[PDB]
Amino acid sequence: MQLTPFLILLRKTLEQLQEKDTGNIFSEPVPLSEVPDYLDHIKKPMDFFTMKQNLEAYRYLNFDDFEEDFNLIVSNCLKYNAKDTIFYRAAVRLREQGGAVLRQARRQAEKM
Ligand SMILES: Cc1cccc2sc3[nH+]ncn3c12
């Protein structure tokens, strides 16, 4: 498998996932200045900007590398926020809509 087409695919996939986050609540790191207790609960923060930096640093060399960090975005948000919040429901919606994006993108990776 060639590296360049794979990273092109991950870039497109990351763009499609970001499009599902219409409120852009996962676009940048959770601002630790506004939620000082966040690192009490969350062992590894994640967000789409960090994912883009990891992608371009060649830290994602298989689809699981990539999907694990996406899953962290979702799971961290479900963990930190109460069920009756916009943030929690946004993570549920992203899990649902993003899972479909990822399934198709992984099938294309497997054609490489
Ligand atoms: C995005 C965001 C901003 C401020 C506070 C919080 S608390 C949380 N959980 N997921 C995202 N966020 C935020």
Curated annotation (Swiss-Prot):
It is found in: Nucleus; Chromosome; Cytoplasm. It is linked to Intellectual developmental disorder with dysmorphic facies and ptosis: An autosomal dominant neurodevelopmental disorder characterized by delayed psychomotor development, intellectual disability, delayed language, and facial dysmorphisms, most notably ptosis. Additional features may include poor growth, hypotonia, and seizures. High levels in testis. Component of some HBO1 complex composed of KAT7/HBO1, MEAF6, ING5, and BRPF1. Component of the MOZ/MORF complex composed at least of ING5, KAT6A, KAT6B, MEAF6 and one of BRPF1, BRD1/BRPF2 and BRPF3. Interacts (via PHD-type zinc finger domains) with unmethylated histone H3 at 'Lys-4' (H3K4me0). Interacts with trimethylated 'Lys-36' of histone H3 (H3K36me3). Interacts with ING5; interaction directs BRPF1 to H4K4me3-enriched chromatin at the 5' of active genes. Interacts with KAT7. Acetylated by KAT6A. Residues 1-105 form the Bromo domain. Scaffold subunit of various histone acetyltransferase (HAT) complexes, such as the MOZ/MORF and HBO1 complexes, which have a histone H3 acetyltransferase activity. Plays a key role in HBO1 complex by directing KAT7/HBO1 specificity towards histone H3 'Lys-14' acetylation (H3K14ac). Some HAT complexes preferentially mediate histone H3 'Lys-23' (H3K23ac) acetylation. Positively regulates the transcription of RUNX1 and RUNX2. This is Peregrin. It comes from the Eukaryota. Disulfide bonds: none annotated. It comes from Homo sapiens. The chain holds residues 628 to 739 of 1214 of the full protein. Transmembrane segments: none annotated.
